[PDB]
Amino acid sequence: NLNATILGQAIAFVLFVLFAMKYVWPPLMAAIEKRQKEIADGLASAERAHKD
Amino acid sequence: NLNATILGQAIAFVLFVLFAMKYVWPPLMAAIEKRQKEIADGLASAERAHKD
Amino acid sequence: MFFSVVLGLLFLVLFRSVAKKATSGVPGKFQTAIELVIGFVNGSVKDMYHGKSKLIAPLALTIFVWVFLMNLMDLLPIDLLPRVVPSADVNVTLSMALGVFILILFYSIKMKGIGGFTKELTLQPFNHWAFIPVNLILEGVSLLSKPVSLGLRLFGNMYAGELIFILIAGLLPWWSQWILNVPWAIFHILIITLQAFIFMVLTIVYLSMAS
Amino acid sequence: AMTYHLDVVSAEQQMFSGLVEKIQVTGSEGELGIYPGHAPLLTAIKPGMIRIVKQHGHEEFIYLSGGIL
Amino acid sequence: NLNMDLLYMAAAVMMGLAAIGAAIGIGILGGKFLEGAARQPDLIPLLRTQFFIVMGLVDAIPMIAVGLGLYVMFA
Amino acid sequence: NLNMDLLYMAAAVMMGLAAIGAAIGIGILGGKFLEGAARQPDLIPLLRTQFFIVMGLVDAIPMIAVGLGLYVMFA
Amino acid sequence: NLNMDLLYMAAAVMMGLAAIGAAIGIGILGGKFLEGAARQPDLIPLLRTQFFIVMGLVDAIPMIAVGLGLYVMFA
Amino acid sequence: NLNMDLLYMAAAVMMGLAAIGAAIGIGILGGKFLEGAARQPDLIPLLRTQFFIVMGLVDAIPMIAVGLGLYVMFA
Amino acid sequence: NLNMDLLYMAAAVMMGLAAIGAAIGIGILGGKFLEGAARQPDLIPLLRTQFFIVMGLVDAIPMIAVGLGLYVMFA
Amino acid sequence: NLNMDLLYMAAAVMMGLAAIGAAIGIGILGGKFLEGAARQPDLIPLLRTQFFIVMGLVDAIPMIAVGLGLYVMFA
Amino acid sequence: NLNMDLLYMAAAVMMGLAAIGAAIGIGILGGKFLEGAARQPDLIPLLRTQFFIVMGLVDAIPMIAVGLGLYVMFA
Amino acid sequence: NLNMDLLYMAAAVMMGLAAIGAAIGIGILGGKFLEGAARQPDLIPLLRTQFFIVMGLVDAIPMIAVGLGLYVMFA
Amino acid sequence: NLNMDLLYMAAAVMMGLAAIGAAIGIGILGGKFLEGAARQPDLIPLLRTQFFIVMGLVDAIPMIAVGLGLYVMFA
Amino acid sequence: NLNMDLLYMAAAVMMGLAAIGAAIGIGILGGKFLEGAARQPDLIPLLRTQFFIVMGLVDAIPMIAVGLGLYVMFA
C-alpha cells in the first residue's frame, strides 16, 4: 500500500461488482426469476385447472 | 506448550459437522421436494381434476 | 507499489471469484436442495426488498446477492484460524470499496430519481423551519457522511474484528483456544456479511421509498 | 376469621357469603396474601378451592369453576 | 508533603463518590415500602421491618467508604 | 503549598460527587409518596411519615460527604 | 500559584458533578406529580405541596455543592 | 500560566458534567407529560404548566454549573 | 505551552461528558412519544409538538457544553 | 511535547465518555419501538419514522463528541 | 514517598467508587422483596431466602473492592 | 516519552468508559425484544429485525470509541 | 518508584469502579427473580436456574476487573 | 519509566470502567428473560436463545475493553 497498492485493493471489489451488473444481473436475475416463474407457474396452472 | 489448535478445531469439526449438516440438510431437502413437489403436486392433481 | 499490493490481489481473487460463479451458476444446476436454497435466498431477498420497492430492483437483487456472495471473501480468513499480509489491504480493500459504493448508490437514486433532482431543492423550507438554512443543510450533511460513514465504519470495522480474531489465533503457544474462539469469531463473521446485505436492504427501503 | 363482609354471588343466585378476615388464595395475578385491609381493586380467579379465614376463624377451602372477584 | 497531600485527596475520593450508592439505595427501598403499603395497606407491619433491614445493609456500604475516608484523614 | 492545594481539590471531590446520590434519592422517595397517594388517597397519613424518615436517611449520606468536605476546607 | 490553581480546579469539580443529582432529582419529582395527577386529577391540591417540599429538599443538596464551589472561588 | 491553565481545565469540568443532569432531567419531565396526556387527554391544560415549572427548575441546576464555568473563563 | 495544553484537555472534558445527558434525554422523550402513541393513536397530533419542545430543551444543555468546548478550542 | 500529550489525552476523554449517552439513548428508543409495536401492531408504520428521527437526534450528540475528538487528533 | 502516596490515593479510589454498586444493588433487591410481598403476601417465605442470597452476592462485589482497599492500606 | 505515555493513558480512557454505553444499550434492546415477544408471541418476526437494527446502531457508538482507542495505540 | 506508584493507582482504578456493574447487575437479576415468582409462584423451578446463570455471567465481568487488579498488585 | 507507568494506569482505566456496562447489561437481559417467562411460561424455548444472543453481544463490549487492557499490560 506504499503507493497505489491499497488503491487497487479496493478497486478489485468495485470491478467484481460491475461484472456482476452486466452479465450476472442479466443471466442470474433472470435465473432466480426462472425458478420463481417456474414453481409459481406450475402451481398457478394447478389452481386454474382445479377451479374451472 | 504444544501447537494444539487444529486438534480442537478438527474434533469440533467432526461432532459439529454432524450436528450442523444434519440440522440444515433435512430441512433444505424437504424444502426442495417441498417446492418442486409443490408446484408439481398441485399441477398434477389439478390436471386429474380438470380433465376428469 | 509492491508492498501490500499482495493484499489487494487477495481481495481481487475473492471478488472476481464471486462475480464469475454467478453467471456460471444460473444455467446450472444448481443442487437438489439447490433449488430450495435458491428459493429461500432469492425470494426472501425479494420480500425484504420491499423495503425499497422497485428502484434498484433488478440491480438490487443482483446487488445484495453479491453483498453476501462476495462477502464470504474475508470470511475465509476467520476460518484460517482453526506473507503475514495476505488479507490486510484486502480487508481494507473491502472496507474502502464498501463505504465508497454506499455514497455512490445514494447518487444513483439522486440522478436516477428525485432524489438528487429533488435534492437540488432539498435545501428546502427545512432550511427555513429552523429559520437558518444550515438547519436542513447541516442535517443533510451529517446524513450524507453517515451513509458512507456508518457504511464503511462497519465495513472495515468487521474486516478489522476478523483480523483481530485471526492474530489472536496466531500468537498463542498452546493454540487449542484459538480453535475454540475461531468458531465464535466465525459466527461473528456470518453475522457481519448478512448484516451487510441488511444494510443494503435498508438503503433500499430508503432508496426506492425515498429518492 | 370475619372481616370485610365477604359474600359469594352467582348469576342464578349468590354462591355464598360471610365476613372473611383472611381469604387464602392465589389471585389470577399470583399468590394473594389472605388479608383484611386490601385496597379497592378488581380481580378474577380460576376454578379451585381457597381456604379462607371467614367469620370467627372459620377457614375453608372452596372449589371454584372460574369466575370473577 | 506528597504523602500528606495524597491522604487528603484520597479521603475526598473515597468519602464522597461511594456514599452516592446508599444515598440512592436507601431511597429505593423507602420508595418500595411506600408503594407496597399504598397498594396493600394491611401488609405494613410485615414489610416495615424488611425496609429497616434493607436500609441498614445499603447504609453499611457507605459506612465502609466513610471508614476508609476517616482512616486516610486521621490514621 | 502542595498540602493546601490537595485540601482544596479534595474538598471539591468529596463535596460534589457524593451529594448527587441524595439529590437523586430524596427525589425518588418523594416520587413514591406522590404516586402512592395518587393511587390510594386514604393512605396519606400512613406514608407521609415514612417519606420523611426515608428522606432524612438518604440526606444523611451527603451530609457525611459535606462533613468530609468541611473538614478538608476548615480543619 | 499552586494553591490558586487548586482552588479553580476544585471549584469546577464540586460545582458541576454534584449538581447533576438535583437536575435529575427535581425532574423525577415533577414526573411523579404529572403522572399522579394524570391518573387521579382530584388529588392535585394534595400532592402539589408535596412536590414543592420534595423539589426544595432535592435542590438543597446541589446548593451545598454550589456553596463549596463559591467558597473555593471567593473565600 | 499555572493559574490560567487551571481556569481552563476547571471551566471544562464544571460546564459539561453537571449539565448532563438536566439534559436527562428535562427529558424525564417531558416523558411524564407525554405519557400522562396519552393516558388521560383531558388533563393536558392541568399538567402542561406543571411540566414548564418543573423543566425550569431542573434547567436552573445546569445554569448554576454554566455560571461557574463562565466565571472561570471570563471572571 | 501549559495554557494551550490545558485548553485542549478542557475542550475534551466539557465537550464529551455533558453531551451524554442529552444523548440519553432526547431518547427518553422519543421513547415516551412512541409508547404514548402506541397506547393511544388518536393523541399523536397533541403529543408530537410536546416531543419537539422537549427534545430541543434537552438538546440545549449539550449545546451549552459544546459552546464551552468551542470557546476553549477557538476563543 | 506537553501540548501534543494534552491533545491525545483530550481526544480519549471527549471521544469515549460522551458517546455512552447515545449508546444508551439509541437503545432506549428502539426498546420503545419494540414495546409499542408488540402492544399495538397496527401502529408500526406510524411509530417507525418517529424511531428513526429520534435515533438520529440522539446519535448527533456523540457525533458532536466524536467531532471534538477528531479535531483534537487531526486539527 | 511516591509509592506511599500512590497507595493512599489507590485505597481511596478502589474503596469508595465500586462499593456504590452494592449500596444500590442491595437496595434494588429489598425493593423487589417489599413489592413482591405487598402484591402477594403468601409468597413471603419463598422469596425471603432469595432476597438474602441475592443481597450477599451483590455485597460480595464491594467486599472485593474493600479487600483491594485494605491491601493497599495495610499490605 | 511524555507523548507516548499520553497515548497509552488516552487509549485506556476512550476505550473503556464509552463502551459501557452499548454494553447497557444492547442489553436494553434485547430486554425489550424478550418482553415484547413474551407479551405477544405472534409479533416475533416483526420485531426481531428491529432488535438487530437497533443493536447495531447502539454497537456503532462504542466502535467509534474503540476506533479512537486503536488510533491512539497504533496510529 | 514511578512504575510501582502507577501499579498501586491502577489496581485501585480497575478493581473498584468496574465491579460496581455487577454489584448492580446481580441485584437486577434477583429483583426480576423475586418479582417473577411473586407474580407467578408455579414458575419458581423454571426461572431459578435462569437467575443463577445470569448472576454468574454478570459476576464474571467484575472478576475480569479484579483479575487485572490482582495482576497489577502481584504480577 | 513514564511510559511503563502510563501503561499500568491505562490498563486499570480501560479494564474496569467499561466492563461495568456489561455487568449491568447481561443482568438487564436475564431480568427480561425471567420476567417474560414468569408472565408467559409457554414462550420459554422461543426467548431463551434470544437471551443467549443478547448476553453475548453485551459481553463483547467489555471483551473489547479487556482486550485493550491486556494490550496495555502485555503488548
Numbering used by the authors:
A (entry chain I), B (entry chain J): 2 to 53
C (entry chain K): 46 to 127, 140 to 268
D (entry chain H): 1 to 69
E (entry chain O), F (entry chain N), G (entry chain M), H (entry chain V), I (entry chain U), J (entry chain T), ...: 3 to 77
Sentences from the study reporting this entry:
In most cells, the bulk of ATP, the principal source of cellular energy, is synthesized by ATP synthase. This molecular generator couples ion flow across membranes with the addition of inorganic phosphate (Pi) to ADP thereby generating ATP. Like the analogous complexes in other kingdoms, it is based on two reversible motors, termed F1 and Fo, connected by central and peripheral stalks. In vivo, subunit ε is believed to change conformation in an ATP-dependent manner to prevent rotation of the complex thereby conserving ATP when its concentration is low.
Three different conformations of the complex were identified using 3D classification in RELION. Three of the four classes containing 104,510 (State 1), 67,829 (State 2) and 53,587 (State 3) particles were movie-refined and post-processed in RELION producing maps at 7.4, 7.8, 8.5 Å, respectively. Once a complete model was built of the highest resolution map, this was docked and refined to the other two maps to create three models. In all three rotational states of the E. coli F-ATPase, the εCTD had an extended conformation, albeit with a different proportion of particles observed at each state (46%, 30% and 24%), suggesting State one to be the lowest energy. In all three reconstructions, the εCTD is in an extended conformation, stabilizing an overall F1 motor conformation similar to that seen in the thermophilic Bacillus PS3 F1 ATPase structure. All three reconstructions showed the complex in its autoinhibited state, with clear density for the εCTD extending deep into the central cavity of the F1 enzyme. The cryo-EM maps resembled the ‘open, closed, open’ conformation as seen in the Bacillus PS3 F1 crystal structure, despite different nucleotide binding positions. Interpolation between States 1, 3 and 2 to simulate ATP synthesis by E. coli F-ATPase.
